[PDB]
Motif scaffolding. Structure first.
Motif, PDB file in Angstrom:
ATOM      1  N   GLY B  51      55.844 -23.065  67.332  1.00 54.83           N
ATOM      2  CA  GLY B  51      54.440 -23.290  67.073  1.00 54.83           C
ATOM      3  C   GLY B  51      54.105 -23.322  65.601  1.00 54.83           C
ATOM      4  O   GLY B  51      54.921 -23.704  64.758  1.00 54.83           O
ATOM      5  N   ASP B  52      52.878 -22.917  65.291  1.00 53.77           N
ATOM      6  CA  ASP B  52      52.412 -22.904  63.914  1.00 53.77           C
ATOM      7  C   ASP B  52      53.095 -21.795  63.131  1.00 53.77           C
ATOM      8  O   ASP B  52      53.124 -20.641  63.567  1.00 53.77           O
ATOM      9  CB  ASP B  52      50.900 -22.710  63.875  1.00 53.77           C
ATOM     10  CG  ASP B  52      50.155 -23.892  64.429  1.00 53.77           C
ATOM     11  OD1 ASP B  52      50.813 -24.805  64.964  1.00 53.77           O
ATOM     12  OD2 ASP B  52      48.912 -23.914  64.327  1.00 53.77           O
ATOM     13  N   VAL B  53      53.643 -22.142  61.973  1.00 56.35           N
ATOM     14  CA  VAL B  53      54.179 -21.139  61.061  1.00 56.35           C
ATOM     15  C   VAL B  53      53.115 -20.688  60.072  1.00 56.35           C
ATOM     16  O   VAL B  53      53.013 -19.497  59.765  1.00 56.35           O
ATOM     17  CB  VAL B  53      55.425 -21.696  60.347  1.00 56.35           C
ATOM     18  CG1 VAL B  53      56.036 -20.650  59.432  1.00 56.35           C
ATOM     19  CG2 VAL B  53      56.439 -22.178  61.365  1.00 56.35           C
ATOM     20  N   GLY B  79      53.970 -28.659  63.511  1.00 54.80           N
ATOM     21  CA  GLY B  79      52.980 -28.732  62.456  1.00 54.80           C
ATOM     22  C   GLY B  79      52.461 -27.389  61.973  1.00 54.80           C
ATOM     23  O   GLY B  79      52.893 -26.315  62.394  1.00 54.80           O
ATOM     24  N   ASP B  80      51.492 -27.486  61.055  1.00 51.64           N
ATOM     25  CA  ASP B  80      50.812 -26.359  60.408  1.00 51.64           C
ATOM     26  C   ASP B  80      51.819 -25.458  59.684  1.00 51.64           C
ATOM     27  O   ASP B  80      52.072 -24.313  60.057  1.00 51.64           O
ATOM     28  CB  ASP B  80      49.956 -25.578  61.409  1.00 51.64           C
ATOM     29  CG  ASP B  80      48.614 -26.237  61.652  1.00 51.64           C
ATOM     30  OD1 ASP B  80      48.439 -27.392  61.216  1.00 51.64           O
ATOM     31  OD2 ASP B  80      47.745 -25.620  62.300  1.00 51.64           O
ATOM     32  N   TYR B  81      52.395 -26.028  58.630  1.00 59.21           N
ATOM     33  CA  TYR B  81      53.474 -25.365  57.919  1.00 59.21           C
ATOM     34  C   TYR B  81      52.954 -24.557  56.744  1.00 59.21           C
ATOM     35  O   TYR B  81      53.723 -23.829  56.113  1.00 59.21           O
ATOM     36  CB  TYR B  81      54.467 -26.404  57.400  1.00 59.21           C
ATOM     37  CG  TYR B  81      55.158 -27.122  58.514  1.00 59.21           C
ATOM     38  CD1 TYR B  81      56.214 -26.560  59.188  1.00 59.21           C
ATOM     39  CD2 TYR B  81      54.771 -28.405  58.854  1.00 59.21           C
ATOM     40  CE1 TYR B  81      56.823 -27.237  60.211  1.00 59.21           C
ATOM     41  CE2 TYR B  81      55.373 -29.087  59.851  1.00 59.21           C
ATOM     42  CZ  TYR B  81      56.398 -28.510  60.528  1.00 59.21           C
ATOM     43  OH  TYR B  81      56.971 -29.244  61.527  1.00 59.21           O
ATOM     44  N   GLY B 111      50.979 -31.587  61.700  1.00 57.48           N
ATOM     45  CA  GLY B 111      49.883 -30.817  62.239  1.00 57.48           C
ATOM     46  C   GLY B 111      48.587 -31.165  61.523  1.00 57.48           C
ATOM     47  O   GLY B 111      48.542 -32.001  60.625  1.00 57.48           O
ATOM     48  N   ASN B 112      47.518 -30.488  61.939  1.00 57.34           N
ATOM     49  CA  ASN B 112      46.202 -30.784  61.388  1.00 57.34           C
ATOM     50  C   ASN B 112      46.004 -30.218  59.988  1.00 57.34           C
ATOM     51  O   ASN B 112      45.073 -30.639  59.294  1.00 57.34           O
ATOM     52  CB  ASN B 112      45.117 -30.260  62.323  1.00 57.34           C
ATOM     53  CG  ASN B 112      44.940 -28.768  62.228  1.00 57.34           C
ATOM     54  OD1 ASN B 112      45.888 -28.005  62.403  1.00 57.34           O
ATOM     55  ND2 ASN B 112      43.715 -28.337  61.964  1.00 57.34           N
ATOM     56  N   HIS B 113      46.845 -29.282  59.556  1.00 57.00           N
ATOM     57  CA  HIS B 113      46.747 -28.720  58.217  1.00 57.00           C
ATOM     58  C   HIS B 113      47.643 -29.426  57.214  1.00 57.00           C
ATOM     59  O   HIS B 113      47.863 -28.899  56.122  1.00 57.00           O
ATOM     60  CB  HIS B 113      47.065 -27.226  58.239  1.00 57.00           C
ATOM     61  CG  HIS B 113      45.942 -26.386  58.752  1.00 57.00           C
ATOM     62  ND1 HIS B 113      45.818 -25.046  58.463  1.00 57.00           N
ATOM     63  CD2 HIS B 113      44.880 -26.702  59.531  1.00 57.00           C
ATOM     64  CE1 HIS B 113      44.732 -24.570  59.044  1.00 57.00           C
ATOM     65  NE2 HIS B 113      44.146 -25.554  59.699  1.00 57.00           N
ATOM     66  N   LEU B 161      53.591 -31.686  70.870  1.00 58.01           N
ATOM     67  CA  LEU B 161      52.460 -32.185  70.104  1.00 58.01           C
ATOM     68  C   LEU B 161      51.745 -30.994  69.491  1.00 58.01           C
ATOM     69  O   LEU B 161      51.677 -29.935  70.112  1.00 58.01           O
ATOM     70  CB  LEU B 161      51.511 -32.975  71.013  1.00 58.01           C
ATOM     71  CG  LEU B 161      50.159 -33.469  70.510  1.00 58.01           C
ATOM     72  CD1 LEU B 161      50.298 -34.247  69.219  1.00 58.01           C
ATOM     73  CD2 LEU B 161      49.489 -34.303  71.582  1.00 58.01           C
ATOM     74  N   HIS B 162      51.219 -31.163  68.277  1.00 58.76           N
ATOM     75  CA  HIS B 162      50.489 -30.067  67.652  1.00 58.76           C
ATOM     76  C   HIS B 162      49.135 -29.860  68.316  1.00 58.76           C
ATOM     77  O   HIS B 162      48.849 -28.784  68.850  1.00 58.76           O
ATOM     78  CB  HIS B 162      50.312 -30.313  66.156  1.00 58.76           C
ATOM     79  CG  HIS B 162      49.458 -29.284  65.489  1.00 58.76           C
ATOM     80  ND1 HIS B 162      49.872 -27.982  65.310  1.00 58.76           N
ATOM     81  CD2 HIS B 162      48.205 -29.353  64.981  1.00 58.76           C
ATOM     82  CE1 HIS B 162      48.915 -27.296  64.714  1.00 58.76           C
ATOM     83  NE2 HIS B 162      47.893 -28.106  64.500  1.00 58.76           N
ATOM     84  N   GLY B 163      48.288 -30.876  68.288  1.00 58.23           N
ATOM     85  CA  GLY B 163      46.986 -30.823  68.921  1.00 58.23           C
ATOM     86  C   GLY B 163      47.042 -31.246  70.370  1.00 58.23           C
ATOM     87  O   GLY B 163      48.036 -31.031  71.067  1.00 58.23           O
ATOM     88  N   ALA B 235      50.550 -26.351  69.999  1.00 57.52           N
ATOM     89  CA  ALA B 235      50.652 -25.275  69.026  1.00 57.52           C
ATOM     90  C   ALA B 235      49.393 -24.998  68.223  1.00 57.52           C
ATOM     91  O   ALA B 235      49.400 -24.061  67.420  1.00 57.52           O
ATOM     92  CB  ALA B 235      51.791 -25.568  68.047  1.00 57.52           C
ATOM     93  N   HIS B 236      48.318 -25.757  68.405  1.00 59.21           N
ATOM     94  CA  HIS B 236      47.228 -25.736  67.438  1.00 59.21           C
ATOM     95  C   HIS B 236      46.348 -24.492  67.543  1.00 59.21           C
ATOM     96  O   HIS B 236      45.670 -24.150  66.568  1.00 59.21           O
ATOM     97  CB  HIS B 236      46.403 -27.018  67.595  1.00 59.21           C
ATOM     98  CG  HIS B 236      45.270 -27.141  66.629  1.00 59.21           C
ATOM     99  ND1 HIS B 236      45.295 -26.568  65.377  1.00 59.21           N
ATOM    100  CD2 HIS B 236      44.083 -27.784  66.727  1.00 59.21           C
ATOM    101  CE1 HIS B 236      44.164 -26.838  64.751  1.00 59.21           C
ATOM    102  NE2 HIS B 236      43.415 -27.581  65.545  1.00 59.21           N
ATOM    103  N   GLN B 237      46.365 -23.785  68.668  1.00 62.09           N
ATOM    104  CA  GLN B 237      45.489 -22.640  68.873  1.00 62.09           C
ATOM    105  C   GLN B 237      46.260 -21.330  68.791  1.00 62.09           C
ATOM    106  O   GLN B 237      47.466 -21.279  69.042  1.00 62.09           O
ATOM    107  CB  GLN B 237      44.775 -22.724  70.222  1.00 62.09           C
ATOM    108  CG  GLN B 237      43.383 -23.307  70.136  1.00 62.09           C
ATOM    109  CD  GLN B 237      42.821 -23.652  71.494  1.00 62.09           C
ATOM    110  OE1 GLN B 237      43.566 -23.908  72.438  1.00 62.09           O
ATOM    111  NE2 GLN B 237      41.499 -23.663  71.602  1.00 62.09           N
TER     112      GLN B 237
END
Ligand SMILES: [Mn+2]
Ligand SMILES: [Mn+2]
Lengths: 211, 290, 194
Positions: B51-53, B79-81, B111-113, B161-163, B235-237
């Protein structure tokens, strides 16, 4: 009951045959001699015929020393050309031994009928292991599934360990009590259902023999 | 090159950041590697889906101790590294180095970030300025982020998928035809791909984040049956239990940053896929720091 | 300061109890302190008390636990003997070779890496080697480049008569693989092995 009704007398033919043939006092028959008969690399079926046909005359109390040599050589009995009389006689002797030493005999037979791909493939199967998971007795050599005299033995051990797991789970429940009855009943019902499903999958004509 | 990459990886394992020329030669090689990858990158099992790191580097080291070292364990990061981890630069540099050195043993998704505005707002730009003085490394990393694949597909069944999903996306062919080489827009199928969330709801809805949508069980079921998918990894939440099944085990949300924000107290997890998609979850606490 | 008899009387059931702890760092500390117990305990007592968990750590869910257990196997073998290794650890490690899960196979190759150096030459080349050559056809590339790396590592330790006889053809076969990493580690094994 199947392990108990076999002790019921029929016509006195067995006591007669024992009295007329065991008095030959040909004491060459021994677990060592039968082990040497099995362990011959040019294996001869005639000698093991003679020895186990003599063994059928023995009483169950005096068949105890032959349990190890009878069980531990059962993997050789699946080796594509073993005569049906050898298998039937070994099944008869196992059924005789089942009436006096079943708790040991089931463990020895389960340890004997492993696939034995590795050096042991968990030869340390204890009685506790088989009472915890009765489905271990269905993880055999897979050549037994077309060997009816060894299906008889494995079905006997499967029924026995399925019965023993209920008592084992009740004992563990009372010991760890110091609901769970519902979960124990669900586990037992699912265990018997899994055993029946695996048995029915054994009955299937697998595709290796289909074509 | 390969020896230099291995030296950079064993340097970045103990949180030493790379130099500017190292970031040059690493990002402009990751650009070459990530160009060949499609939007729906075919990941072969086995892989450990993460997931998100979120820049928590010591938690990423804990993640590597839990799931295994690359290249021994195949990893797939959704994503969201970056963005409000204390060591986002080191985290993204190390994972990009692993992507360059082992192109088939790790797949890194966008990811979104990984947008320019989101890194400008939430402290990745400030971290690059603090750790390097100039600002070229931040835009180097965002130019790399433009090249990152949007989605991943494991065996044609698990859609990582991230989102979440999009109202404008009904097929994976739409995702394959998206022009991913761009900054993440405020609206559109790519923004919905990177920003959406699932919900216990009866259809679509506007996400509280202000970007992307939110979707219910029926949308997830329709997307899964229309594309031949059995699962949508996400992974986004944030999840306090690390992983959380949603929509009758059609969407699973995996968070891999334990003690998110260094305050949330969550207990993160990673998803290990076997040889035959026999999944396993490895929850792990935040790593001790001395 | 106390001794192994009183420790085995008092603290040994407790540490056996929390060697199956939920948190992996506790188990890691237990694994790290297993050589301390193995120093002052006999082989028979350690067999009847302290090897079910020592083998169950190899099939753990945490990589760090399996790595610590793998490094612990060397310390156990180098003290209690090649015969104890072959009697206890070798069948349990070989059980992980045919395991369908991939990281159990990488665990048994890490066991190969730490066990070749402490099992001597002949035991290594007649037990450990055929498994490593056997599993080089595994459909997962992570197993295959680990086969190449393990053949590089156990190469100088195993019997030199079998090296060019057996290892080099399968190293060339791994060098002709589809994956880039398998080819790289196979050619690294070929160059180091020479
Ligand atoms: Mn995030
Ligand atoms: Mn996100």
């Amino acid at each position: 009951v199947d392990d108990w009704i076999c002790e019921e007398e029929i016509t006195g033919t067995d006591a007669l045959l024992r009295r007329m043939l065991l008095t030959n006092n040909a004491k060459n028959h021994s677990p060592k001699q039968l082990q040497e008969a099995f362990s011959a690399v040019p294996v001869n079926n005639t000698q093991v015929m003679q020895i186990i046909e003599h063994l059928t005359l023995l009483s169950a109390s005096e068949l105890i020393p032959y349990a190890e040599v009878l069980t531990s050589n059962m993997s050789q009995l699946l080796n594509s050309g073993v005569p049906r009389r050898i298998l039937q006689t070994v099944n008869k002797l196992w059924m005789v031994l089942n009436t006096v030493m079943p708790r040991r005999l089931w463990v020895m037979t389960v340890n004997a009928l492993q696939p034995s791909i590795k050096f042991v493939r968990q030869q340390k199967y204890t009685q506790n292991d088989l009472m915890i998971d009765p489905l271990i007795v269905l993880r055999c050599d897979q050549r037994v599934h077309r060997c009816p005299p060894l299906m008889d033995i494995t079905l006997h051990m499967l029924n026995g360990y399925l019965l023993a797991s209920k008592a084992y789970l009740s004992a563990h429940l009372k010991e760890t009590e110091q609901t769970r009855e519902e979960l124990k009943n669900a586990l037992l019902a699912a265990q018997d259902s899994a055993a029946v499903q695996i048995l029915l999958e054994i009955c299937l004509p697998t595709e290796e023999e289909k074509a | 090159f390969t020896k230099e990459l291995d030296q950079w990886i064993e340097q970045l394992n103990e949180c030493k950041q790379l130099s500017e020329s190292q970031v040059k030669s690493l990002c402009e090689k990751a650009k070459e590697i990530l160009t060949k990858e499609s939007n729906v990158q075919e990941v072969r099992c086995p892989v450990t889906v993460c997931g998100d790191v979120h820049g928590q580097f010591h938690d990423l080291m804990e993640l590597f101790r839990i799931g295994g070292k690359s290249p021994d364990t195949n990893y797939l990061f959704m994503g969201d590294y970056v963005n409000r981890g204390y060591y986002s630069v080191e985290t993204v540099t190390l994972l990009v180095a692993l992507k360059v050195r082992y192109r088939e043993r790790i797949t890194i998704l966008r990811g979104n970030h990984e947008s320019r505005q989101i890194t400008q707002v939430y402290g990745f730009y400030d971290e690059c300025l603090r750790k390097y003085g100039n600002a070229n490394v931040w835009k180097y990393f965002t130019d790399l982020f433009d090249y990152l694949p949007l989605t991943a597909l494991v065996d044609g069944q698990i859609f990582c998928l991230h989102g979440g999903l999009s109202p404008s996306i009904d097929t994976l062919d739409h995702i394959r035809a998206l022009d991913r080489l761009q900054e993440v827009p405020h609206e559109g199928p790519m923004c919905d791909l990177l920003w959406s969330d699932p919900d216990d709801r009866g259809g679509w809805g506007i996400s509280p984040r202000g970007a992307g949508y939110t979707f219910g069980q029926d949308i997830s079921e329709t997307f899964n049956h229309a594309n031949g998918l059995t699962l949508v990894s996400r992974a986004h939440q944030l999840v306090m239990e690390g992983y959380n099944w949603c929509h009758d085990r059609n969407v699973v949300t995996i968070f891999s940053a334990p003690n998110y924000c260094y305050r949330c107290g969550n207990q993160a997890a990673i998803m290990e896929l076997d040889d035959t998609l026999k999944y396993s979850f490895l929850q792990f606490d935040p790593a001790p720091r001395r | 300061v106390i001794g192994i008899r009183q420790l085995s009387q008092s603290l040994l059931p407790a540490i056996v109890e929390l060697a199956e702890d939920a948190k992996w760092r506790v188990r890691l500390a237990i694994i790290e302190y297993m050589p301390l117990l193995a120093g002052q305990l006999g082989v028979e007592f350690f067999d009847e008390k302290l090897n079910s968990l020592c083998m169950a750590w190899l099939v753990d869910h945490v990589y760090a636990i399996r790595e610590a257990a793998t490094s612990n196997l060397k310390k156990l073998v180098e003290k209690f003997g090649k015969e104890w290794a072959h009697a206890t650890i070798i069948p349990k490690v070989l059980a992980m070779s045919g395991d369908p899960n991939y990281l159990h196979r990488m665990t048994t190759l890490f066991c190969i890496n730490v066990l070749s150096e402490v099992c001597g030459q002949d035991i290594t080349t007649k037990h450990m080697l055929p498994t490593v050559l056997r599993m080089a056809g595994d459909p997962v590339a992570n197993v295959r480049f680990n086969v190449a790396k393990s053949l590089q590592k156990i190469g100088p330790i195993l019997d030199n008569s079998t090296l060019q006889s057996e290892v080099k053809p399968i190293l060339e076969k791994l060098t002709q693989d589809q994956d880039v990493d398998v080819k790289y580690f196979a050619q690294e094994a070929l160059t180091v092995l020479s």
